[PDB]
Design an enzyme around this catalytic site. Structure first.
Site, PDB file in Angstrom:
ATOM      1  N   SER B 105       0.847  -1.185   0.000  1.00 57.69           N
ATOM      2  CA  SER B 105       0.000   0.000   0.000  1.00 57.69           C
ATOM      3  C   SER B 105       0.892   1.248   0.000  1.00 57.69           C
ATOM      4  O   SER B 105       1.852   1.308  -0.805  1.00 57.69           O
ATOM      5  CB  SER B 105      -1.016  -0.092   1.125  1.00 57.69           C
ATOM      6  OG  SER B 105      -2.013   0.918   0.898  1.00 57.69           O
ATOM      7  N   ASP B 187      -8.961  -4.215  -6.287  1.00 56.84           N
ATOM      8  CA  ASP B 187      -8.556  -3.467  -5.146  1.00 56.84           C
ATOM      9  C   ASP B 187      -9.619  -2.418  -4.794  1.00 56.84           C
ATOM     10  O   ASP B 187      -9.931  -1.539  -5.597  1.00 56.84           O
ATOM     11  CB  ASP B 187      -7.219  -2.768  -5.476  1.00 56.84           C
ATOM     12  CG  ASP B 187      -6.535  -2.162  -4.282  1.00 56.84           C
ATOM     13  OD1 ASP B 187      -7.234  -1.573  -3.451  1.00 56.84           O
ATOM     14  OD2 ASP B 187      -5.279  -2.247  -4.227  1.00 56.84           O
ATOM     15  N   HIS B 224      -7.442  -5.206  -1.507  1.00 59.47           N
ATOM     16  CA  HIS B 224      -6.249  -4.460  -1.214  1.00 59.47           C
ATOM     17  C   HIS B 224      -5.302  -5.241  -0.310  1.00 59.47           C
ATOM     18  O   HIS B 224      -4.070  -5.275  -0.539  1.00 59.47           O
ATOM     19  CB  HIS B 224      -6.638  -3.111  -0.597  1.00 59.47           C
ATOM     20  CG  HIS B 224      -5.496  -2.163  -0.470  1.00 59.47           C
ATOM     21  ND1 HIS B 224      -4.765  -1.718  -1.542  1.00 59.47           N
ATOM     22  CD2 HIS B 224      -4.938  -1.491   0.612  1.00 59.47           C
ATOM     23  CE1 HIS B 224      -3.861  -0.831  -1.114  1.00 59.47           C
ATOM     24  NE2 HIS B 224      -3.918  -0.671   0.168  1.00 59.47           N
TER      25      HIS B 224
END
Ligand SMILES: *[C@@H]1O[C@H](CO)[C@@H](O[C@@H]2O[C@H](CO)[C@@H](O)[C@H](O)[C@H]2NC(C)=O)[C@H](O)[C@H]1NC(C)=O
Ligand SMILES: *[C@@H]1O[C@H](CO)[C@@H](O[C@@H]2O[C@H](CO)[C@@H](O)[C@H](O)[C@H]2NC(C)=O)[C@H](O)[C@H]1NC(C)=O
Ligand SMILES: [K+]
Ligand SMILES: [K+]
Ligand SMILES: [K+]
Ligand SMILES: [K+]
Ligand code: NA
Ligand code: NA
Ligand code: NA
Ligand code: NA
Ligand code: NA
Lengths: 316, 316
Positions: B105, B187, B224
């Site tokens: 991330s 995502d 994600h």
């Protein structure tokens, strides 16, 4: 558990009847029907042509199926109307004899939703054999919902949805007719399934809950499609179908049956199609409807999900 | 690309050092370190304890991580000071040998910000393996925050932000060291990611850009967090870490690796924790600091975002 009148159907009878087919027969006059209820993103033939249509035929049934359009992606509650209508029809059409229901994926949720909310069919279904049923939904649909790329029924099949809440609160996580649920800890579509316990999406209280890893070992791997199509699945399904109790029996299968590849009695070409079962489902999802909220509950189910939020707002 | 001195740190080195930990080792004397850079709303352990700490250990590395406080919610430019200091330390502590960096991330945005603006580390980073990096930020205004009432690094990760503009204009959307980016069309935090092209937030020019669906098909779903934790992600990451080129190799992975569930080598308990990665991170963002503007760029980055708006106005 509801025990009053059936809800009225939203769809006309002509529409619901159009979604039901039997192999080599009309529903109005059919010998030893079995009703097959397909998975998300498929028609009846797409779910079962490579597997339970020929396998059930070899067991002496006449396979029949519904194909709620488009590809089981619309409202699960309407998908259920197709199933309830079909059981009513096939029971009448086969001498008032109860019939079995065999399902994959969402089809099991549809079956149990119908048994929960439409009491009339309880006396018409002798057993339910559900492969990879998602009675609690799946947590894995969450990102799709967040991205607004989820079909109606994908929202409904998300853990925590209004639909799954209503099923639970109406008593639908307990079996209603004798039920066998065959599922896998390694199912890549439906989770959670790992615990071999009531926490699993496929588990029903008082049911015959067959997690493949319980039989075959925790290291055993069998995927979402294989849960329907495998040799192991055939032996468990045959057990359920033949059992006088209406549930599979642990005596009927063991380690010697722990073959996750397509059922042995399928032809080579059927095995190829079975192994590739999920591809067309993925492509139908891809082309299919997408929305940013869960479809509303029909009136009969609202009391069971008070406070959940659907497209129109909070259930009151 | 910038090519002079490293910007001065705003934080004391003691503070930066205190944010670096290795498993079983001093940063001054460590075997085959890998530096792990966490996602927003987490510390290093919260990002990686269930995944790349044990997975890298089994590959023979000593995992080391940074935990910029509070939970990666503060200025991404300060988060990057922790990374730069750590690379300096670990390079010396491994005998003056380059080391891999692995990120989730925002951690990938941090790594590339550091490589773009702190030239000294370029010779010290062997390769970058970034999972779900948001180099372009995200267009999705999620449901955690009221619009424009957000943490420092959440502003900075919004598409259009001064920070992401500066990264791009300084040349940082081209790989600087051998880089693999593993990401997903599904995502739910970072978009756009759907195109398998330079539109996508995770793409770097000349990088090994691996959108999972391009390999696995269009209904391969990893979110994600699943971008970091899945078995598919492990196979790609292992390829990236072993490859003699510094990038993952398509020869090393294919359809058979397309399992979206947590990496197979994780224990049963780590798989549960890996699947639960996101929710408490999201809660830390919810509980964290909020402001009504994007943090100001540090001096060294301003000339690359002239015309963008931060808390002190239009950048000059
Ligand atoms: C898909 O499901 C929806 C929702 O249940 C169906 O639409 C409803 O159809 C009834 C019957 O005509 C209407 O009274 C409602 O107004 C409809 N609601 C909505 C939101 O449109 C629809 O028929 C189903 N589609 C198919 C192809 O079965
Ligand atoms: C969080 O980030 C801000 C930079 O946006 C940091 O605050 C700066 O800290 C330096 C170093 O002391 C000061 O000289 C600046 O005046 C500060 N700027 C602002 C806007 O306050 C802050 O130190 C970071 N906090 C942590 C815990 O890392
Ligand atoms: K018909
Ligand atoms: K007949
Ligand atoms: K028996
Ligand atoms: K390349
Ligand atoms: Na297993
Ligand atoms: Na809306
Ligand atoms: Na946290
Ligand atoms: Na801005
Ligand atoms: Na463990």
């Amino acid at each position: 558990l509801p025990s009053g009148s059936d809800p009225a159907f939203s769809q006309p009878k002509s529409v619901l009847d159009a979604g039901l087919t039997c192999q080599g027969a009309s529903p109005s006059s059919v010998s030893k029907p079995i009703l097959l209820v397909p998975g998300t993103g498929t028609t009846g033939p797409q779910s079962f042509d490579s597997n339970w249509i020929p396998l059930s035929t070899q067991l002496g049934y006449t396979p029949c199926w519904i194909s709620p359009p488009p590809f089981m992606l619309n409202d699960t509650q309407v998908n259920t109307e197709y199933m309830v209508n079909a059981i009513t029809a096939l029971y009448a059409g086969s001498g008032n004899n109860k019939l079995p229901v065999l399902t994959w994926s969402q089809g099991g949720l549809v079956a149990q939703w119908g048994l929960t909310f439409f009491p009339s069919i309880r006396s018409k279904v002798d057993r339910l054999m559900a492969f990879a049923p998602d009675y609690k939904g799946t947590v894995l649909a969450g990102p799709l919902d967040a991205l607004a790329v989820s079909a109606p029924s994908v929202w409904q099949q998300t853990t925590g949805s209004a639909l799954t809440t209503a099923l639970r609160n109406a008593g639908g996580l307990t079996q209603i007719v004798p039920t066998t649920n065959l599922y896998s800890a390694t199912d890549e579509i439906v989770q959670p399934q790992v615990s071999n316990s009531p926490l699993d999406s496929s588990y029903l209280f008082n049911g015959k809950n067959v997690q493949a890893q319980a039989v075959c070992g925790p290291l055993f791997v069998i995927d979402h499609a294989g849960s329907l199509t495998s040799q192991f699945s055939y032996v468990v399904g045959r057990s359920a179908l033949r059992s006088t109790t209406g549930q599979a029996r642990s005596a009927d299968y063991g380690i010697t049956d722990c073959n996750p590849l397509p059922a042995n009695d399928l032809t080579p070409e059927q095995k190829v199609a079975a192994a590739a079962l999920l591809a067309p489902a993925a492509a139908a999802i891809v082309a299919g409807p997408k929305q940013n909220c869960e479809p509303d509950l029909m009136p009969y189910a609202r009391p069971f999900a008070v406070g959940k939020r659907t497209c129109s707002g909070i259930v009151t």
